[PDB]
Design a protein around this ligand. Structure first.
Ligand SMILES: O=C(O)c1cc2ccc(I)cc2[nH]1
Ligand SMILES: O=C(O)c1cc2ccc(I)cc2[nH]1
Ligand SMILES: O=C(O)c1cc2ccc(I)cc2[nH]1
Ligand SMILES: O=C(O)c1cc2ccc(I)cc2[nH]1
Ligand SMILES: O=C(O)c1cc2ccc(I)cc2[nH]1
Ligand SMILES: O=C(O)c1cc2ccc(I)cc2[nH]1
Ligand SMILES: O=C(O)c1cc2ccc(I)cc2[nH]1
Ligand SMILES: O=C(O)c1cc2ccc(I)cc2[nH]1
Ligand SMILES: [Cl-]
Ligand SMILES: [Cl-]
Lengths: 212, 212
């Protein structure tokens, strides 16, 4: 599309979008246009408001668009077009992407005993409540574990909450420890969000014992 | 009072205040308490809402307090008290101060001719639409002009808009130019807001001719 300001809105939280170039108070010649999961192509919202959209998004006195609680279906394009007292036309363009942070990831069914030279199920990492899905990754003593390599194998699984649409991730790690290695390695798991500039969450490490 | 987070809210703009430690969605055991120009001591606001206060401030689904258009009377203390699913009590304390930026200051009735050795009316600086009042200051070639020093005299005036309560400032500068000075000095005027970390606004300079 066109050049836009990217907005990352957290699910459940309010969102205010500024209509640039609008008078600070009524009277106002402005209109918002949005194309989201809630619309069939473009929907026009006006200061006068009215109808079902009043429960989703309303134009504020200063012309900004206000959404009291952002949802998954509010992802999309939000545009404002305004005329000021001097007659200049000003346009605002926002690309809104929504997200939710999962709870802290947890390692379940961890092994306490690993045999070197044979495949071993190390553990299962679980992360619940993310949007977008994001990914789970494993770490050995700080170094990321690369799947399908040095005897490392990972299986992954994704479920969706039937009501909220938030994602639960599950990742099982299997390793074949090399003969003559660290007898007490430290394994950990991290959740990486799908969105840029978002922090990664890490589990408490597990430290099984290995048989050389 | 108690330790608080300072909030500077612009008049006419929405304000969202987070209720820390609250569940992200209803059901919620929280309450807001506010003491502002609108209240007689403390007023309690609840998620259920209702009554005239619904037109001024409402608790959002995530527990935050939302004011669609802040006014002068909204200055004051805003507190939230919340219990989470684990039973921990969390308190939020906000000291809200409101403001409005005036229009660009202007010099009117500026003189084109100053006689050195006698008092001369240099000009009158005008700033309209500020809250809080703020102050007007004069500058000679970048250097601030200190009133009642070196033949400098300033007279000041403050008016209030009868409906909006915003302030209009007026400042008249008189100087006695020293014999043997800059034949074309540059005078300017600046508005300094009453609130900290807010930028100063400066007028276009005036450059009269001075009389040796
Ligand atoms: O209500 C009106 O008269 C009015 C609405 C509106 C929306 C965008 C532009 I550019 C001018 C406008 N004028
Ligand atoms: O009338 C409106 O709401 C409106 C239309 C429109 C077209 C391109 C861009 I960038 C912003 C816009 N805003
Ligand atoms: O029924 C109500 O009290 C009520 C719901 C609702 C949804 C979005 C907006 I903006 C204002 C609202 N008021
Ligand atoms: O002027 C008013 O009373 C007023 C208008 C208006 C529009 C959207 C929302 I959310 C709150 C509002 N309050
Ligand atoms: O009656 C209720 O449900 C209720 C409200 C409320 C507000 C703050 C705190 I700490 C506990 C609370 N319990
Ligand atoms: O125009 C309306 O129906 C309307 C007024 C109004 C005042 C405060 C809040 I929070 C929401 C509002 N909606
Ligand atoms: O979940 C609730 O009780 C609740 C809905 C809702 C919609 C608009 C506004 I402003 C405040 C709200 N609070
Ligand atoms: O109702 C109360 O007793 C009460 C609530 C509340 C919220 C924040 C702070 I700092 C002090 C408080 N006292
Ligand atoms: Cl539609
Ligand atoms: Cl009261």
């Amino acid at each position: 599309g066109a050049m836009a300001q990217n907005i990352t809105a957290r699910i459940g939280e309010p969102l205010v979008l500024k209509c640039k170039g609008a008078p600070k108070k009524p009277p106002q010649r402005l209109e918002w246009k949005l194309n989201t999961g809630r619309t069939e192509a473009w929907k026009v919202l006006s200061p006068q408001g009215g109808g079902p959209w009043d429960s989703v998004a309303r134009v504020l006195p200063n012309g900004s668009l206000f959404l009291p609680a952002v949802g998954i279906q509010d992802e999309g394009i939000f545009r404002c077009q305004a005329m000021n007292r001097n007659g200049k036309e000003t346009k605002s363009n926002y690309r809104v992407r929504v997200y939710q942070i999962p709870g802290k990831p947890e390692i379940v069914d961890s092994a306490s005993e690993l045999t070197a030279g044979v495949p071993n199920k190390v553990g299962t990492c679980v992360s619940e409540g993310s949007y977008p899905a994001g990914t789970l990754s494993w770490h050995l003593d700080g170094k990321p574990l690369v799947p399908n390599e040095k005897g490392v194998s990972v299986k992954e699984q994704t479920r969706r909450h039937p009501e909220t649409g938030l994602f639960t991730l599950q990742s099982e790690l299997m390793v074949t420890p090399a003969r003559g290695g660290d007898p007490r390695p430290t394994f950990s798991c991290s959740f990486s969000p799908g969105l840029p500039r978002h922090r990664a969450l890490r589990t408490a490490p597990i430290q099984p014992r290995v048989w050389e």
